[PDB]
């Protein structure tokens, strides 16, 4: 079995969340950026961090991960969040309303609404699941 | 072309069974000069199937405690055993060896299933690889039992074992023990 450990996984997550700009997809370059910055003991421990970094950067292209937080990714997700269509989903020419809701609006002095259209309710009073 | 020991060609040999055709390595990329390659076929699973069948024969003959590393003696045992068969049958010793391997393997076997005590064995199939391995085992076991305390030199008792098996004859240790083995497995159907 070839399973990493919390030491290498934690160190790699920290490196990725702190130095996203310089890290990339290439292993042999991420191996050389880790030695420049992090004070790591010998090559065997250096490589297992810089390999999981390369593995874990591919997942970022697929989308965000529940372990790291890049403010550049925050900006990208905010650009995604600041999305509104030109025509909203709540402005409709016609709104379908039940006969029972129409009476509630009548009690709400909203009987002059012109976008409404009273529809025929379902007749069979069968809305329960069979028992057994 | 590259022929065994410089005098036994390979391109004329044909494997009959489609079942063991890919588990016997004799013809195109396995055509070697000697049954000696310092191979590493025992590192991963199913790698031994790529071992030449003549070299597979060579190993199983250096068995019992006094011979476990004396491979050069077994290379000449096989070398002399191939030049004797060709004098009797007149055919290719490689073809004789292949036909002996095909004939002497069991095709059905029995496996212990009942709890300890009374034996309730079932009937199961046999892998092609195990069939090849067990054919080699039986052929090498019959060669050294028939020569243990005889004036007959070994590589003459091996030749006689291989001749009688390519004919499917009952004068052969491997055929005798293959027939007794599928007999019991049919009883357990």
């Amino acid at each position: 079995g070839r399973v990493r450990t919390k030491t290498v996984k934690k160190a790699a997550r920290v490196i990725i969340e702190k130095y996203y700009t310089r890290l990339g997809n290439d292993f042999h370059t991420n191996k050389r950026v880790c030695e420049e910055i992090a004070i790591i003991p010998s090559k065997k421990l250096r490589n297992k961090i810089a390999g999981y970094v390369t593995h874990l950067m591919k997942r970022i292209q697929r989308g965000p991960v529940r372990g790291i937080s890049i403010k550049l990714q925050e900006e990208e997700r905010e650009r995604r969040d600041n999305y509104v269509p030109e025509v909203s989903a709540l402005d409709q020419e016609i709104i379908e309303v039940d006969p029972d809701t129409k009476e509630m609006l009548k009690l709400l002095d909203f009987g002059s609404l012109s976008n409404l259209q009273v529809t025929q309710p379902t007749v069979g009073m069968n809305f329960k699941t069979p028992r057994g | 072309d590259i022929k065994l020991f410089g005098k036994w060609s390979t391109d004329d040999v044909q494997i009959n069974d489609i079942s063991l055709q890919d588990y016997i390595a004799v013809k195109e990329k396995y055509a070697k000069y000697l049954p000696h390659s310092a191979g590493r076929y025992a590192a991963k699973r199913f790698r031994k199937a790529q071992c030449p069948i003549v070299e597979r024969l060579t190993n199983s003959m250096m068995m019992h405690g006094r011979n476990n590393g004396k491979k050069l003696m077994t290379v000449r045992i096989v070398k002399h055993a191939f030049e004797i068969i060709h004098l009797l049958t007149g055919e290719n010793p490689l073809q004789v060896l292949v036909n002996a391997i095909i004939n002497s393997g069991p095709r059905e076997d029995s496996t212990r299933i009942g709890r300890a005590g009374t034996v309730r064995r079932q009937a199961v199939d046999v892998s092609p690889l195990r069939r090849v391995n067990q054919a080699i085992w039986l052929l090498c076991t019959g060669a050294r039992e028939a020569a243990f305390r005889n004036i007959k030199t070994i590589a003459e008792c091996l030749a006689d074992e291989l001749i009688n098996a390519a004919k499917g004859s009952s004068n052969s240790y491997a055929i005798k023990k293959k027939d007794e083995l599928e007999r019991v497995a049919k009883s357990n159907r």
């Binding site: - | 069974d17 489609i18 079942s19 699973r45 199913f46 095709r107 059905e108 076997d109 496996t111 212990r112 299933i113 079932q122 009937a123 199961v124 199939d125 046999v126 892998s127 092609p128 690889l129 195990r130 069939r131 391995n133 599928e182 049919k186 159907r189």
Partner: protein, 61 residues
Amino acid sequence: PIKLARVTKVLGRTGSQGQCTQVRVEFMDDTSRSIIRNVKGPVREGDVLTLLESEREARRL
């Protein structure tokens, strides 16, 4: 008579000590029929078995 069937997939390991393997095999003639069989030895997909009795279907060992 003797039938030849081709291993299509390996299901698992059965036997008192795990010495046998479940396979499903597809016949060469009338290839539409596939049955469950037990084998002994190393088996991988693509191996072709020689069935002497070709009516039985396998069960747990």
